[PDB]
Scaffold this motif. Sequence first.
Motif, PDB file in Angstrom:
ATOM      1  N   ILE A  80     106.789  16.304  35.880  1.00 27.28           N
ATOM      2  CA  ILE A  80     106.190  17.401  36.630  1.00 27.28           C
ATOM      3  C   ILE A  80     104.707  17.147  36.885  1.00 27.28           C
ATOM      4  CG2 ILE A  80     105.683  19.862  36.676  1.00 27.28           C
ATOM      5  CD1 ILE A  80     108.606  19.269  36.944  1.00 27.28           C
ATOM      6  N   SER A  81     103.970  16.859  35.818  1.00 25.03           N
ATOM      7  CA  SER A  81     102.539  16.596  35.925  1.00 25.03           C
ATOM      8  C   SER A  81     102.269  15.442  36.885  1.00 25.03           C
ATOM      9  CB  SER A  81     101.953  16.278  34.548  1.00 25.03           C
ATOM     10  OG  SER A  81     100.643  15.750  34.662  1.00 25.03           O
ATOM     11  N   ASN A  82     103.118  14.423  36.828  1.00 21.04           N
ATOM     12  CA  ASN A  82     102.973  13.256  37.691  1.00 21.04           C
ATOM     13  C   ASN A  82     103.118  13.646  39.160  1.00 21.04           C
ATOM     14  OD1 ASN A  82     103.304   9.932  37.681  1.00 21.04           O
ATOM     15  ND2 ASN A  82     104.342  10.964  39.386  1.00 21.04           N
ATOM     16  N   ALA A  83     104.161  14.413  39.462  1.00 19.59           N
ATOM     17  CA  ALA A  83     104.411  14.856  40.827  1.00 19.59           C
ATOM     18  C   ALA A  83     103.262  15.712  41.347  1.00 19.59           C
ATOM     19  CB  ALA A  83     105.721  15.628  40.898  1.00 19.59           C
ATOM     20  N   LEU A  84     102.621  16.445  40.444  1.00 16.05           N
ATOM     21  CA  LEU A  84     101.503  17.307  40.813  1.00 16.05           C
ATOM     22  C   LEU A  84     100.216  16.500  40.948  1.00 16.05           C
ATOM     23  CD1 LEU A  84     102.758  19.921  38.378  1.00 16.05           C
ATOM     24  CD2 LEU A  84     101.816  20.744  40.544  1.00 16.05           C
ATOM     25  N   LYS A  85     100.019  15.551  40.038  1.00 20.69           N
ATOM     26  CA  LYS A  85      98.831  14.708  40.057  1.00 20.69           C
ATOM     27  C   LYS A  85      98.724  13.947  41.374  1.00 20.69           C
ATOM     28  CE  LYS A  85      98.343  11.105  37.133  1.00 20.69           C
ATOM     29  NZ  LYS A  85      99.101  11.249  35.859  1.00 20.69           N
ATOM     30  N   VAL A  86      99.836  13.363  41.808  1.00 22.34           N
ATOM     31  CA  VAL A  86      99.867  12.609  43.055  1.00 22.34           C
ATOM     32  C   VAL A  86      99.527  13.499  44.245  1.00 22.34           C
ATOM     33  CG1 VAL A  86     101.515  10.888  42.247  1.00 22.34           C
ATOM     34  CG2 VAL A  86     102.339  13.023  43.267  1.00 22.34           C
ATOM     35  N   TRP A  87      99.705  14.804  44.070  1.00 22.81           N
ATOM     36  CA  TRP A  87      99.418  15.764  45.129  1.00 22.81           C
ATOM     37  C   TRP A  87      97.992  16.293  45.012  1.00 22.81           C
ATOM     38  CZ3 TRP A  87     104.535  18.946  44.248  1.00 22.81           C
ATOM     39  CH2 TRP A  87     105.619  18.142  44.622  1.00 22.81           C
ATOM     40  N   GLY A  88      97.427  16.201  43.811  1.00 22.23           N
ATOM     41  CA  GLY A  88      96.074  16.674  43.590  1.00 22.23           C
ATOM     42  C   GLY A  88      96.015  17.815  42.592  1.00 22.23           C
ATOM     43  N   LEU A  89      97.182  18.271  42.149  1.00 23.45           N
ATOM     44  CA  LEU A  89      97.259  19.366  41.187  1.00 23.45           C
ATOM     45  C   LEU A  89      97.289  18.836  39.759  1.00 23.45           C
ATOM     46  CD1 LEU A  89      97.186  21.783  42.907  1.00 23.45           C
ATOM     47  CD2 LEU A  89      98.725  20.112  43.949  1.00 23.45           C
ATOM     48  N   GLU A  90      96.492  19.447  38.888  1.00 23.06           N
ATOM     49  CA  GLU A  90      96.430  19.037  37.490  1.00 23.06           C
ATOM     50  C   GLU A  90      96.765  20.203  36.565  1.00 23.06           C
ATOM     51  OE1 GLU A  90      92.553  18.432  35.675  1.00 23.06           O
ATOM     52  OE2 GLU A  90      91.593  19.180  37.506  1.00 23.06           O
ATOM     53  N   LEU A  91      97.518  19.915  35.509  1.00 19.16           N
ATOM     54  CA  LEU A  91      97.909  20.939  34.547  1.00 19.16           C
ATOM     55  C   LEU A  91      96.910  21.018  33.399  1.00 19.16           C
ATOM     56  CD1 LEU A  91     101.601  19.986  34.772  1.00 19.16           C
ATOM     57  CD2 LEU A  91     100.979  22.405  34.633  1.00 19.16           C
ATOM     58  N   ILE A  92      96.532  22.238  33.032  1.00 20.05           N
ATOM     59  CA  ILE A  92      95.584  22.450  31.945  1.00 20.05           C
ATOM     60  C   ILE A  92      96.145  23.416  30.908  1.00 20.05           C
ATOM     61  CG2 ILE A  92      93.129  22.710  31.471  1.00 20.05           C
ATOM     62  CD1 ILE A  92      93.847  20.877  33.819  1.00 20.05           C
ATOM     63  N   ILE A 113     101.872  27.772  35.534  1.00 17.49           N
ATOM     64  CA  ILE A 113     103.158  27.330  35.008  1.00 17.49           C
ATOM     65  C   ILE A 113     103.330  27.750  33.552  1.00 17.49           C
ATOM     66  CG2 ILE A 113     104.633  25.360  34.495  1.00 17.49           C
ATOM     67  CD1 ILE A 113     104.451  25.714  37.388  1.00 17.49           C
ATOM     68  N   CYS A 114     104.386  28.510  33.283  1.00 14.58           N
ATOM     69  CA  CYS A 114     104.665  28.978  31.930  1.00 14.58           C
ATOM     70  C   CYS A 114     105.796  28.173  31.299  1.00 14.58           C
ATOM     71  CB  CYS A 114     105.027  30.464  31.946  1.00 14.58           C
ATOM     72  SG  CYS A 114     103.700  31.554  31.383  1.00 14.58           S
ATOM     73  N   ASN A 115     105.687  27.929  29.997  1.00 12.79           N
ATOM     74  CA  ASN A 115     106.701  27.168  29.275  1.00 12.79           C
ATOM     75  C   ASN A 115     107.172  27.928  28.037  1.00 12.79           C
ATOM     76  OD1 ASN A 115     106.769  25.540  26.571  1.00 12.79           O
ATOM     77  ND2 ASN A 115     107.798  24.221  28.070  1.00 12.79           N
ATOM     78  N   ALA A 153      98.342  36.889  29.247  1.00 11.50           N
ATOM     79  CA  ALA A 153      97.592  37.112  28.016  1.00 11.50           C
ATOM     80  C   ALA A 153      98.523  37.480  26.865  1.00 11.50           C
ATOM     81  CB  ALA A 153      96.550  38.199  28.223  1.00 11.50           C
ATOM     82  N   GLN A 154      99.578  38.225  27.180  1.00 13.90           N
ATOM     83  CA  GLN A 154     100.543  38.647  26.171  1.00 13.90           C
ATOM     84  C   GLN A 154     101.338  37.454  25.647  1.00 13.90           C
ATOM     85  OE1 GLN A 154     102.709  42.568  27.446  1.00 13.90           O
ATOM     86  NE2 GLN A 154     102.686  42.382  25.209  1.00 13.90           N
ATOM     87  N   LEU A 155     101.594  36.489  26.524  1.00 10.33           N
ATOM     88  CA  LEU A 155     102.345  35.297  26.150  1.00 10.33           C
ATOM     89  C   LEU A 155     101.519  34.396  25.236  1.00 10.33           C
ATOM     90  CD1 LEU A 155     103.771  34.494  29.697  1.00 10.33           C
ATOM     91  CD2 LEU A 155     104.142  36.462  28.199  1.00 10.33           C
ATOM     92  N   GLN A 156     100.278  34.135  25.636  1.00  2.00           N
ATOM     93  CA  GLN A 156      99.388  33.290  24.851  1.00  2.00           C
ATOM     94  C   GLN A 156      99.113  33.907  23.484  1.00  2.00           C
ATOM     95  OE1 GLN A 156      96.192  33.973  28.026  1.00  2.00           O
ATOM     96  NE2 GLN A 156      94.964  34.092  26.151  1.00  2.00           N
ATOM     97  N   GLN A 157      98.868  35.214  23.470  1.00  3.68           N
ATOM     98  CA  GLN A 157      98.591  35.924  22.226  1.00  3.68           C
ATOM     99  C   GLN A 157      99.848  36.036  21.371  1.00  3.68           C
ATOM    100  OE1 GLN A 157      97.320  39.843  23.406  1.00  3.68           O
ATOM    101  NE2 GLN A 157      99.393  40.700  23.301  1.00  3.68           N
ATOM    102  N   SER A 161     103.646  28.877  25.954  1.00  2.43           N
ATOM    103  CA  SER A 161     102.859  27.776  26.496  1.00  2.43           C
ATOM    104  C   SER A 161     102.419  28.075  27.926  1.00  2.43           C
ATOM    105  CB  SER A 161     103.665  26.477  26.459  1.00  2.43           C
ATOM    106  OG  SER A 161     103.679  25.922  25.156  1.00  2.43           O
ATOM    107  N   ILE A 162     101.136  28.377  28.093  1.00  2.00           N
ATOM    108  CA  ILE A 162     100.589  28.682  29.410  1.00  2.00           C
ATOM    109  C   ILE A 162      99.833  27.487  29.981  1.00  2.00           C
ATOM    110  CG2 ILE A 162      98.855  30.009  30.654  1.00  2.00           C
ATOM    111  CD1 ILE A 162     100.418  31.621  27.654  1.00  2.00           C
ATOM    112  N   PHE A 163     100.298  26.990  31.122  1.00  2.76           N
ATOM    113  CA  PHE A 163      99.666  25.848  31.773  1.00  2.76           C
ATOM    114  C   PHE A 163      98.973  26.275  33.064  1.00  2.76           C
ATOM    115  CE2 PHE A 163     102.858  23.719  29.142  1.00  2.76           C
ATOM    116  CZ  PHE A 163     102.091  22.720  28.573  1.00  2.76           C
ATOM    117  N   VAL A 164      97.756  25.780  33.267  1.00  3.54           N
ATOM    118  CA  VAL A 164      96.986  26.108  34.461  1.00  3.54           C
ATOM    119  C   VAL A 164      97.014  24.961  35.465  1.00  3.54           C
ATOM    120  CG1 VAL A 164      94.747  26.812  35.367  1.00  3.54           C
ATOM    121  CG2 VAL A 164      95.458  27.553  33.082  1.00  3.54           C
ATOM    122  N   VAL A 165      97.614  25.210  36.624  1.00  3.08           N
ATOM    123  CA  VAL A 165      97.707  24.198  37.671  1.00  3.08           C
ATOM    124  C   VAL A 165      96.627  24.399  38.728  1.00  3.08           C
ATOM    125  CG1 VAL A 165      99.118  23.260  39.531  1.00  3.08           C
ATOM    126  CG2 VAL A 165     100.182  23.885  37.351  1.00  3.08           C
TER     127      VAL A 165
END
Length: 171
Positions: A80-92, A113-115, A153-157, A161-165
Motif C-alpha cells: 500500500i505504502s509503495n503504491a502511494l509513494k510512487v504517486w506522491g502520498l506518504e503514510l505517517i 487510513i485506519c488500521n 481521536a477515540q481510536l488512537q486513545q 492504528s491511525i495512519f496519515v496519508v
Amino acid sequence: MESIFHEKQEGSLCAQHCLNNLLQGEYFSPVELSSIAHQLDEEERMRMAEGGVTSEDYRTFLQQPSGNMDDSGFFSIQVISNALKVWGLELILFNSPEYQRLRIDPINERSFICNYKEHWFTVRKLGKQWFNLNSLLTGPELISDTYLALFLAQLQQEGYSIFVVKGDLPD
C-alpha cells in the motif's frame, strides 16, 4: 452525491478497492495488486529468514511485513505504502514522531487510513466533508470534520492504528 463510487461487495480489506476508491476511480487491477503483494511478502520472507546486514533489514522489519490471519490479513503496508509513494502520498503513523513533528491536523489532512486488528479502513477528504469506505463496507460513509477529529481521536486513545496519508493525489 452522484460522483461517489457506490458499490457493495463481500470481503475484508481490499487492495484494489482501497487504491481505486482512494484515487476516486479505477486506476489499478486486483490481479496486479495481488501479485505485487505476494512477491513482496515472499521476498521479505526469504530475505528475513536468511537474515540481512543493512539498514534495509531494520526498516523492513519495522514495517512489520506479512500478516497473521486471513480475509483482511492478505495485503501489507509495504504494498500500500509503495503504491502511494510512487504517486506522491506518504503514510505517517500517529504514534510516530513524524505525525507530531509536522503537526498535521486531522480535518486539514488530505488522505487518512485506519488500521484495526484484522480489519482496514480507507478515509479520503472530499471538499468540506470526509468520506469513508472499505472492502467490508457496502456504501460510502460521510463524516464531518468536527466529528472526524473526535472519531479518530477515540481510536488512537483507545488502541487503534491511525495512519496519515499526505501528498499529491490525482483527484
